[PDB]
Structures are given as structure tokens and as C-alpha cells.
Enzyme design. Structure first.
Site, PDB file in Angstrom:
ATOM      1  N   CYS A   1       6.359   0.552   8.027  1.00  0.00           N
ATOM      2  CA  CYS A   1       5.868   1.650   7.201  1.00  0.00           C
ATOM      3  C   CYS A   1       6.978   2.092   6.267  1.00  0.00           C
ATOM      4  O   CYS A   1       8.110   2.306   6.720  1.00  0.00           O
ATOM      5  CB  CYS A   1       5.480   2.839   8.087  1.00  0.00           C
ATOM      6  N   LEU A   2       6.644   2.275   4.982  1.00  0.00           N
ATOM      7  CA  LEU A   2       7.622   2.736   3.998  1.00  0.00           C
ATOM      8  C   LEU A   2       8.174   4.115   4.330  1.00  0.00           C
ATOM      9  O   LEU A   2       9.275   4.457   3.872  1.00  0.00           O
ATOM     10  CB  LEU A   2       6.997   2.759   2.595  1.00  0.00           C
TER      11      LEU A   2
ATOM     12  N   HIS B   1      -2.421   7.541   7.284  1.00  0.00           N
ATOM     13  CA  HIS B   1      -1.516   8.406   6.519  1.00  0.00           C
ATOM     14  C   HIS B   1      -2.239   9.648   6.006  1.00  0.00           C
ATOM     15  O   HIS B   1      -1.647  10.731   5.940  1.00  0.00           O
ATOM     16  CB  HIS B   1      -0.944   7.654   5.316  1.00  0.00           C
TER      17      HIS B   1
ATOM     18  N   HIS C   1      -4.046   1.620   8.105  1.00  0.00           N
ATOM     19  CA  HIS C   1      -2.756   2.288   8.005  1.00  0.00           C
ATOM     20  C   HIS C   1      -2.787   3.382   6.942  1.00  0.00           C
ATOM     21  O   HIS C   1      -2.239   4.476   7.142  1.00  0.00           O
ATOM     22  CB  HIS C   1      -1.726   1.204   7.670  1.00  0.00           C
TER      23      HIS C   1
ATOM     24  N   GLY D   1       0.827  -1.191   0.000  1.00  0.00           N
ATOM     25  CA  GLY D   1       0.000   0.000   0.000  1.00  0.00           C
ATOM     26  C   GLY D   1       0.863   1.243   0.000  1.00  0.00           C
ATOM     27  O   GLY D   1       2.007   1.231   0.474  1.00  0.00           O
TER      28      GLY D   1
ATOM     29  N   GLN E   1       2.633  10.138   1.255  1.00  0.00           N
ATOM     30  CA  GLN E   1       3.960   9.535   1.329  1.00  0.00           C
ATOM     31  C   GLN E   1       4.850   9.870   0.139  1.00  0.00           C
ATOM     32  O   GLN E   1       6.055   9.604   0.210  1.00  0.00           O
ATOM     33  CB  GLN E   1       3.837   8.024   1.443  1.00  0.00           C
TER      34      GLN E   1
END
Ligand SMILES: [Cl-]
Ligand code: NI
Length: 169
Positions: free
Chosen positions: A90-91, A136, A132, A45, A50
Site C-alpha cells: 500500500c502506498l 481506503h 483495496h 491505484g 490517501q
């Protein structure tokens, strides 16, 4: 096509993302670029904040094979059930992994990539991912839910990751 993923403490990750108002060609390009970025990072995702775009938009592919790509535009949680622990990363907090509590089952309504309303119900990884992603869009990162000691440890791992990337040619 592949855009840079932002890392904590970038303040763009803390904004409250604005709803998508216009389904134009630029939005399709953004969706395609987000998929490319997500696959390159080997994620399931990615939310628009992001990559520095303050829009309530996320892309999802749980299996990874492009067979069931999900786009959620302007999502709202319609219902949820249960609460359980998830081991999560988390990226945008690379290198930091810890346990957080989220709903066990969630149903989200949203617009698809063409503006058609749909609803999706998830358990397991999909439920975790949907929650999640919505976090964000609200400027919330999973480390916010951790104890002070565990948040400090996550930041130390993040800083080590950043230093390692900076040593690369
Ligand atoms: Cl992520
Ligand atoms: Ni994340």
C-alpha cells in the site's frame, strides 16, 4: 499537481469518505492530480483519502500506459466470487508487504469521471485493487487484516522507511 501521499497512522486515512456530490472543475483537477500522484509513486491505484481528500473517489491504471484509465466515483460492490491470498502493499504503508485474503472476482458499479454509471468486473490485480480502493474509502488499510505480530512487523518497516526519507536533504 503531484500531491503528498499520507502514511499510516494519519487519521485522515481512517475516516469514512463522503460520497462525491458535485462534478465540478475542482473534481476534474483532483482526478488529474491523483493520476499524476499515482504515476509518480509508480502505483496502479490511488484513493482520494490517501492525499487527504475525504471523498469516495479512486483512480486506477493497471497496465500503467494511460491507455485504459479508470475512475471510480461512489463505488459499490454488486457481487463477488471466491476468496484467495494476495501478496499486497500500500502506498500509504510504504515498505510493508504481506499476505491478505480478498475476493477472487468482484463486480463494482460506480460513476465514471463524468458522472455516467458503469460497471467493471475484475479478477487478479484489478480485483485486488478495486477491493483495496474501496477499503481506503472506508478507512481500512490492509495491515488491519494481519496478525498482531505481522502488523507490528509492518509498522517497524514503515518506521524505517520514514526515518530514511527524513535523512534525505
Ligand atoms: Cl495504495
Ligand atoms: Ni493502499
Amino acid at each position: 499537481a503531484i500531491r503528498k501521499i499520507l502514511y499510516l497512522p494519519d487519521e485522515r486515512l481512517r475516516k469514512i469518505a463522503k460520497p462525491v456530490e458535485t462534478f465540478d472543475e475542482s473534481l476534474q483537477t483532483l482526478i488529474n492530480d491523483m493520476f499524476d500522484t499515482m504515476y509518480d509513486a509508480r502505483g496502479v491505484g490511488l484513493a482520494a483519502p490517501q492525499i487527504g481528500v475525504s471523498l469516495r473517489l479512486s483512480v486506477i491504471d493497471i497496465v500503467g500506459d494511460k491507455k485504459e484509465q479508470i475512475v471510480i466515483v461512489n463505488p459499490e460492490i454488486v457481487s463477488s466470487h471466491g476468496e484467495k491470498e494476495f501478496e499486497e502493499g500500500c502506498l500509504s504503508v510504504p515498505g510493508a508487504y504481506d499476505t491478505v485474503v480478498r475476493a477472487e472476482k468482484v463486480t463494482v458499479k460506480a460513476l465514471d469521471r463524468f458522472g455516467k454509471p458503469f460497471e467493471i468486473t475484475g479478477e487478479g490485480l484489478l480485483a485486488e485493487c478495486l477491493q483495496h480502493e474501496i477499503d481506503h474509502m472506508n478507512g481500512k488499510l490492509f495491515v488491519d487484516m494481519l496478525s498482531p505480530l505481522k502488523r507490528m512487523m509492518a509498522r517497524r518497516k514503515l518506521d524505517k522507511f520514514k526515518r530514511l526519507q527524513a535523512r534525505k536533504p
